[PDB]
Design a protein around this ligand. Structure first.
Ligand SMILES: Nc1ncnc2c1ncn2[C@@H]1O[C@H](COP(=O)(O)OP(=O)(O)OP(=O)(O)O)[C@@H](O)[C@H]1O
Ligand SMILES: Nc1ncnc2c1ncn2[C@@H]1O[C@H](COP(=O)(O)OP(=O)(O)O)[C@@H](O)[C@H]1O
Ligand SMILES: [Mg+2]
Ligand SMILES: [Mg+2]
Lengths: 210, 365, 177, 281, 277, 52, 52, 70, 52
């Protein structure tokens, strides 16, 4: 009954109905694996209990990529209808371009040839990775996140060198007019009147290195 | 008699019996609930008989999702027109103590047995995680004062599982088409609770974790899933021959995995690296977008007919499609959509337009 | 007469319209050489580019002002704007002067081209220089070359090549400074 | 390759869905086809013991044996999975006692204990609930004796006792080719031969999926049809060459013309032994 | 099951030594074959500035040569120029000509008869066993002029660096059969040269084309040999890396099976003891 | 875990002082996922590898 | 492994030992033949990870 | 010789053996490193072949016969 | 496998800086001066950060 140890526990994290209050409890159970073995007993127990999964890679963690999210394994089939609608339309592009970057660097590590279109998505996906790094104890509001994802997948952060993007996405949030984030937080959505405006305010950005 | 499910790997390599016991094996996030919901969405809506969903030891979120989704589809109607519903839910989910999960599959079985015996008609019994019945008896039997069996299970595993499973049958008075998902612990098929379940099932659908990590969804292992309908006297000659040819290509590719890993692709023979290319084509082609997965994928679901599957896989087997890329086969319906996706992805490498088409610079008011 | 303009410029055309696009057009040995023959310049006065070649070595890439080559019609000398000449060389000594100093290699025989831009290309097989030849085993070999007259014309030609090489290697080993 | 005499015990060991019950059913159907062409002192009466199977599978086999015509020679002792563990434990002994009537009256018998692993599982349950102390894989101590005292009853009798025979075909299912498990090693140790089927040869198209290296028959070629013996040593020898010069056949580039003839000749022989089911030759 | 993994671990751990060894061996061969290649690179230049470079000629008879490797652990090098020789044989063949195909290296005869069986007429091999010389390349050239073609096409991989091997096609024309015809530019481009031969211009051009074919064959099979060594050094370093990764996953899975084995037999011993005590 | 924790949890910094423990770590069967190092490593704050 | 090569009796030469393999007991010219055979077969077993 | 350890033998052996055994065990440390590498003896560097030949000399040197201690 | 002069000059500087880092991590110990003579040196933290 070690499955019942956690399923009795993690089923109490619910979103209640309106007739009971509409209150909610969101859980984050933490499992420590041994050698990246997600096929352990307790790990596969809780994987078949929880809704999603945030898999933190130990080889991404020593290459400086922190939070070391295994984007291929990290899933969450319950938050899709629960993301910020401004982020839902700009990070639908983010996870697919990181998929191609996961396809190129997993076969073209030999240095065989540069197809010069797969070579484009290698240093595009390297820019989306460095855009997704984050320091510790410094959370970002969701509006200042979805502009930094807007600034990168729309190519405004293109030809910035990959060791500048930590300093460059700090340049994006600092220089863009703070009234942009107030419209985006309140609509919850990058409206047609705003992405035409937010594309403008990203062209007026002193990116480092030029 | 066959049950066409719309799923390519199921209809080709392990066809389901209309009136038989179907098992979906796999552990912890391989996709045997999305497979059971696609089987509900395809088979149960085009069935005519009644359905019984017995949720044994599963998420309560999933049971509420199925109840609300079945209210929207009219399969479950509320209030005054309730009697025109087509499904009974019996829920013994994973928050229940081990006495309740060990006996809720029997309750759902009884609700199915009444329709089979007394009403005398063909029903569908979807049991999500029949492994939780075995597990709940394994939790109880430590306290009933018994010597434990192998890995830690009860000594009466095979007979408990057998006495439950031998009631889920087609008889002369009715039919029960049983689709049961079976969890495997630690992705080990040699665990006694899946290894005992293997004998009670007509069609086995083994979902593996590595095929899911390759992106191929539904993650059905084609070299570990079987059927008693895969017989040339049941499904025909060309269907059985196409299925055996696909399995021969996949086995010949599985035997080449070590030297491809450690020596490289560049050192096989020409027929070997033709086999590798055709196998990488039919691995992608066995995947399919599901109509119940279109809310978290974005691709529309693709019901494939059985003749479309046989025709497309015969085309890949004979060599009519050695010219297309591999990713033309990834997540498509049938052999027309591989060519549509081929021109859709080879117009994409030519997709470079002039002047960026702005019409945004100083839009007037 | 000029009715087939072949070339790496034009092979690219017929190849690109008839080969699969995963292969780029293959390279050609003219893409690796910088110095042509009919082009402008590369004389500038007195010293012209001399390229001494064997298959196993490059012996001179430096600019020389005169070269003394042993042609089959005699030792000739190549000054700066010399007439273009494809010259077959017999066994003899090649003298690459630059001034007071010169490099004397005895070669085995093989052509030497002078090009209309003044580029001189000596192309021999074995260039055995004079301070590494022995003067004792030459007579031991031309003794048998003088004696042996076979019944076949093939070894007859081989023996005639033997005596014309060894006799020339005689004349350029006693009279050295 | 694995010739089988009247009175020996030949194990059919394999994984799941590899062809074990298929070989057993072909063996019974062929005795139906042979009993019409032989006198009554040469006939073989089959017994099929189904331990731990479904009732649907057993009903399917009975339908098959009536459509072929094998039920005038076949008994079926079926202890299915819903039955009690003592019934599944005692059903091979029941079937062997119903088959020993033919061994003891001078006739000939063919007993097939399908899923002898399931009989061992029923015996383990019945002995763990009787508080007998478990052993390896929680099996009893005498799970070897359980199978030895059953499989030793298959014998070729002397002419004083009638000259009868009982041929046993126990079936043991393994777990991913693990024949080092407890019951697998016990029944490999008991029986004369073994017909080892593979799940990797099964998906190469080789059906029946017989592993020609590990398949042994310790009656030897002493119990082989003559003429088949005249071709069988040659077929074994060329298959033995074709097996060993393989694991180099991936490099089809270098034609060697001495190994390559052996490779394509063994390919002719390996394609020869493929066979559609439910039609014994 | 738990022992076969211990033998598979030792097998992969030994493959990760053998491939590292032959990576070092191929590196030692490459560093001293590059020395001979960049010295052999000189003599090909006077012929390609004297005779030009005409690949797309109207030869009515051709001899193509695919210069491949002998040892076949090179990594897609030999099939690359097989693709190139089936691309250049589908570039000149448009007029109904005779083509002879020969190959240098055993990986040429095993990959050329699969794409084309009838025009392939000769297989030179065992070239790189001792070393590659000019007497050997000239003997190969004489056996090529046992046929009487109007052109020769050499296909080889040119050692640009230890990373890049550009597949070079090299062309030679028969002397007055095609070489004098392709030079006629309202007169001739060869009349500027004063022939100092013992005999007429056709004989000195015959000797020059034989010498040119010899030096481009020698340079071709030197460049391809050392680019073979470089692709083997790079192809056994993507091989020992993958054999280290496979060994690491095997060791992790073996340790999981080891721990599960000790727990399994321990639990069975405890169950057997509690069934008595 | 409870025996190792009851040992290693007394090695802390209080307000009055601190204990800093340097512990030699043996790894059984060269397996870092064995429960004795995998339980011991949850307490360690630094590793000092002395190599030959 | 000796048996599926067809060699009968399938006696492992590099696992079968005797106390009669002293040079004092069976003499030196027998013991040297046996030790040379075992040496040759063991070196072939070492070379089989290349020549296979 | 790579797996057999003695954690006493630092200053617990014969001094005439200690003059030589450090070199002997460091020459064998290179031979065990290059031995399974260069099983073939064809295409070899002039430094690796020398420690291979030295390790093959020391290996046949250390083996001795039974019941005759030296 | 290739040679010391194979690689670049910035690789020469990486080799030189790392070889003088590998020696600067060495330290004479005050307890080992009884059998090595040379006195040991307690290096502060503010000195080793600046030195490296
Ligand atoms: N020679 C053959 N030719 C074609 N199909 C075969 C052949 N042998 C077996 N099969 C098919 O392969 C499958 C093998 O199932 P089989 O009857 O062997 O079950 P089993 O392995 O004995 O037991 P279980 O069902 O528990 O695995 C069946 O579907 C059968 O129809
Ligand atoms: N058919 C599918 N197509 C795409 N993704 C799938 C599919 N099935 C499962 N997945 C992915 O894997 C997860 C597990 O699906 P689910 O069927 O709930 O598995 P299980 O019930 O075995 O844990 C899903 O949340 C999704 O991310
Ligand atoms: Mg589920
Ligand atoms: Mg069976």
């Amino acid at each position: 009954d070690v499955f019942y140890l956690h399923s009795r526990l993690l089923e109490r994290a619910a979103k209640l109905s309106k007739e009971l209050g509409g209150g909610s409890l969101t859980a984050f159970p933490v499992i420590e694996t041994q050698a990246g073995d997600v096929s352990a007993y307790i790990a596969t127990n809780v994987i078949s209990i929880t809704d999603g999964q945030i898999f933190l890679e130990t080889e991404l963690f020593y290459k400086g990529i922190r939070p070391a999210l295994n984007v291929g394994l990290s899933v969450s089939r319950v938050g899709s209808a629960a993301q910020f609608p401004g982020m839902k339309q700009v990070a639908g592009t983010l996870k697919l371009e990181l998929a191609q970057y996961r396809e190129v660097a997993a076969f073209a590590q030999f240095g065989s040839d540069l197809d010069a279109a797969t070579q484009y998505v290698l240093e595009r996906g390297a820019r989306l990775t460095e855009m997704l790094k984050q320091k510790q104890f410094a959370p970002i509001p969701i509006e200042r996140q979805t502009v930094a994802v807007y600034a990168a997948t729309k190519g405004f952060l293109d030809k910035v060198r990959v060791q500048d993007i930590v300093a460059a996405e700090e340049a994006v949030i600092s220089q863009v007019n703070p009234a942009v984030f107030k419209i985006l937080k309140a609509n919850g959505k990058i409206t047609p009147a705003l992405d035409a405006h937010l594309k403008a305010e990203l062209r007026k950005v002193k990116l480092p290195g030029a | 008699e066959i049950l066409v499910t719309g799923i390519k790997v199921v209809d080709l390599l392990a066809p389901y019996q209309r009136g038989g016991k179907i098992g979906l094996f796999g552990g912890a996030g391989v996709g045997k609930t999305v497979l059971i919901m696609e089987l509900i969405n395809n088979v149960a809506k085009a069935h005519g008989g009644f359905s019984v969903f017995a949720g044994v030891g599963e998420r309560t979120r999933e049971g509420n999702d199925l109840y609300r989704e079945m209210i929207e589809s009219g399969v479950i109607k509320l209030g005054a027109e309730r009697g025109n519903s087509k499904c009974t839910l019996v829920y013994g989910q994973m928050n229940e103590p081990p006495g309740a999960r060990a006996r809720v599959a029997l309750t759902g079985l009884t609700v199915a047995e009444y329709f089979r015996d007394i009403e005398g008609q063909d029903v569908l019994l979807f049991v999500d995680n029949i492994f939780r019945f075995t597990q709940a008896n394994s939790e109880v039997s430590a306290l009933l004062g018994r010597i434990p069996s192998a890995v830690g299970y009860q000594p009466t595993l095979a007979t408990d599982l057998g006495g439950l499973q031998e009631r889920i049958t087609t008889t002369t008075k009715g039919s029960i088409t049983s689709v049961q998902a079976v969890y495997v612990p630690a992705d080990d098929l040699t665990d006694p609770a899946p290894a005992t379940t293997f004998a009670h099932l007509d069609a086995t659908t083994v979902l593996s974790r590595s095929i899911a990590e390759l992106g191929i969804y539904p993650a059905v292992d084609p070299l570990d899933s079987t059927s008693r309908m895969l017989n040339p006297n049941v499904i025909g000659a060309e269907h059985y021959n196409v299925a055996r040819g696909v399995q021969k290509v996949l086995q010949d590719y599985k035997n080449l995995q070590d030297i491809i890993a450690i020596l490289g692709m560049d050192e096989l023979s020409e027929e070997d690296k033709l086999t590798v290319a055709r196998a990488r084509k039919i691995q992608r082609f066995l995947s399919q977008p599901f109509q119940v997965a279109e809310v978290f994928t974005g691709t529309p679901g693709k019901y494939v007919d059985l003749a479309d599957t046989i025709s497309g896989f015969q085309g890949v087997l004979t060599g009519k499609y050695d010219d297309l890329p591999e990713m033309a086969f990834y997540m498509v319906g049938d052999i027309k959509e591989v060519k549509e996706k081929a021109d859709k992805m080879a117009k994409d490498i030519a997709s470079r337009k002039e002047a960026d088409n702005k019409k945004v610079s100083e839009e007037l008011k | 007469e000029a009715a087939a303009p072949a070339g790496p410029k034009e092979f690219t055309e017929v190849w690109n319209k008839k080969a699969p696009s995963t292969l780029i057009v293959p390279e050609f040995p003219s893409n690796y050489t910088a110095v042509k023959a009919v082009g402008e310049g590369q004389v500038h006065g007195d010293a012209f580019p001399v390229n001494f070649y064997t298959p196993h070595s490059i012996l001179s890439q430096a600019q020389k002002d005169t070269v003394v080559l042993p042609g089959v019609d005699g030792y000739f000398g190549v000054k700066a704007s010399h007439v273009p000449t494809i010259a077959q060389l017999k066994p003899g000594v090649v003298e690459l002067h630059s001034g007071a100093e010169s490099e004397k290699f005895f070669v085995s025989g093989g052509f030497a081209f002078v090009h209309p831009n003044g580029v001189t290309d000596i192309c021999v097989l074995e260039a055995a220089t004079l301070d590494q030849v022995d003067p004792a085993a030459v007579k031991s070999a031309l003794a048998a070359a003088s004696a042996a007259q076979p019944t076949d014309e093939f070894e007859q030609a081989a023996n005639r090549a033997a005596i014309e090489l060894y006799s020339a290697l005689e004349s350029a080993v006693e009279a050295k400074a | 390759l694995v010739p089988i005499g009247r009175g020996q015990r030949e194990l059919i060991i394999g994984d799941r869905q590899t062809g074990k019950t298929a070989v057993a059913i072909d063996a019974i159907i062929h005795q139906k086809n042979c009993n019409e062409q032989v006198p009554k002192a040469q006939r073989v009466y089959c017994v099929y013991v189904a331990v731990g199977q479904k009732r649907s599978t057993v009903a399917q086999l009975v339908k098959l044996f009536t459509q072929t015509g094998a039920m005038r020679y076949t008994i079926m002792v079926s202890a299915t999975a819903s039955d009690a563990a003592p019934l599944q434990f005692l059903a091979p002994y029941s079937g062997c006692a119903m088959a020993e009537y033919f061994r003891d009256t001078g006739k000939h018998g063919l007993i097939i204990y399908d899923d002898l692993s399931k009989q061992s599982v029923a015996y383990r349950q019945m002995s763990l609930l009787l508080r007998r102390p478990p052993g390896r894989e929680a099996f009893p101590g005498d799970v070897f004796y359980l199978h030895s005292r059953l499989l030793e009853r298959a014998a070729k009798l002397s002419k004083e006792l009638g000259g009868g025979s009982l041929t046993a075909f126990p079936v043991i299912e393994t777990q991913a080719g693990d024949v080092s498990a407890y019951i697998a090693t016990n029944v490999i140790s008991i029986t004369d031969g073994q017909i080892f089927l593979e799940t990797e040869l099964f998906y190469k198209g080789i059906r029946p999926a017989l592993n020609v290296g590990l398949s042994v028959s310790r009656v030897g070629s002493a119990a082989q049809f003559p003429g088949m013996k005249q071709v069988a040593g040659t077929l074994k020898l060329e298959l033995a060459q074709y097996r060993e010069v393989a694991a180099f056949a991936q490099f089809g580039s270098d034609l060697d013309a001495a190994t390559q003839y052996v490779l394509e000749r063994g390919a002719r022989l390996t394609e020869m032994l493929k066979q559609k089911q439910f039609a014994p030759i | 099951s738990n022992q076969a993994v211990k033998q598979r671990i030792r097998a992969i751990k030994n493959i990760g030594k053998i491939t590292k060894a032959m990576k070092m061996v191929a590196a030692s061969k490459m560093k001293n074959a590059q020395i001979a290649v960049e010295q052999s690179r000189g003599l090909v230049d006077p012929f390609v500035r004297l005779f030009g470079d005409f690949p797309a000629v109207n030869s009515n008879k051709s001899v193509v040569v695919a210069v491949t490797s002998d040892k076949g652990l090179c990594g897609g090098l030999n099939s690359n120029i097989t693709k190139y020789t089936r691309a250049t044989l589908a570039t000149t063949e448009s007029e109904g000509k005779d083509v002879v195909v020969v190959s240098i290296g055993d990986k040429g005869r095993s990959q050329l008869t699969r794409i084309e069986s009838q025009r392939y007429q000769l297989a030179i091999a065992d070239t790189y066993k001792v070393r590659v010389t000019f007497g050997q390349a000239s003997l190969i050239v004489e056996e090529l002029i046992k046929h009487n073609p109007q052109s020769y096409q050499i296909l080889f991989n040119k050692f640009r660096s230890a990373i890049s091997f550009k597949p070079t096609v090299a062309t030679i024309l028969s002397p007055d059969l095609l070489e004098k015809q392709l030079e006629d530019v309202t007169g001739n481009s060869l009349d500027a040269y004063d022939i100092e031969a013992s005999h007429e211009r056709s004989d000195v051009l015959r000797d020059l084309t034989e010498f040119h074919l010899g030096v481009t064959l020698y340079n071709a099979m030197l460049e391809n040999n050392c680019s073979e060594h470089a692709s083997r050094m790079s192809a056994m370093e993507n091989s020992t890396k993958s054999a280290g990764e496979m060994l690491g996953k095997l060791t992790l899975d073996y340790n999981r099976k080891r721990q599960a084995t000790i727990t399994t037999e321990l639990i069975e011993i405890i169950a057997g003891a509690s069934a008595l005590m």
